[PDB]
Amino acid sequence: GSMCMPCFTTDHQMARKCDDCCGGKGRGKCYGPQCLCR
Numbered sequence: 001g002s003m004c005m006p007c008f009t010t011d012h013q014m015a016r017k018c019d020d021c022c023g024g025k026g027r028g029k030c031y032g033p034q035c036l037c038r
Contacts, residue, residue: 003034 004021007014007030015028018035022028028035 001034002036004028004037005035006033007031007035008033 005018007018011017014030014035018028018030019025020028021035022037026038028037030036
């Protein structure tokens, strides 16, 4: 699908994980339930 991985509000480190999925610092955004690569 569009998302690299989910974003869950209950994971306080979701932003870091989403960046990891998307290849590093600043590369992913949590937008609602989806981590999307910028």
